[PDB]
Design a protein that fits this description.
Elements: H1 3-9, H2 15-19, E1 26-29, E2 37-40, H3 49-55, H4 58-74
Antiparallel strand pairs: 1-2
The structure holds one DNA strand.
DNA sequence: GTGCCCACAGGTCTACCCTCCAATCGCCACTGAACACAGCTGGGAAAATGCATGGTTTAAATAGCCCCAGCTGGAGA
């Protein structure tokens, strides 16, 4: 993957925060091939679709959106 | 060898838990009040005792009256 795809999706995320999830599972290849890409580690098993669905629920996303909208209105 | 990133450590702030203090309620102990029972006093009722005007016998000074009772004369056998 590329880092600025994630920086386009989450632009409020700073340094450490946005790349602490790239710290694990990914490694910054910059030499020869795959240069300036974050390749997936060969020992890392990418989680299946049901595990990724079990990570975050849509209702948690709605609760987070309610929190940040109320944060804006109060601010 | 200078900008810039990630990781680890430290500090601060928030949350939860435990401890202490205060307040309230309940129970027990003591005090006060009320009710009930007993005793003493006072009043009323009943019973018992102390009554009073009649009588009484003792004459006698009288006198009318009245039953009876002798009793003696008269009559009959």
């Amino acid at each position: 993957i590329r880092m600025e795809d994630i920086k386009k999706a989450f632009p409020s995320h700073s340094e450490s925060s946005i790349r602490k999830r790239l710290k694990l599972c990914a490694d910054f290849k910059r030499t020869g091939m795959d240069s300036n890409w974050w390749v997936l580690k060969s020992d890392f098993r990418l989680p299946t679709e049901e595990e990724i669905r079990a990570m975050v629920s849509p209702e948690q996303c709605c609760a987070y959106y309610s929190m940040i909208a109320a944060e804006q209105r109060l601010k």
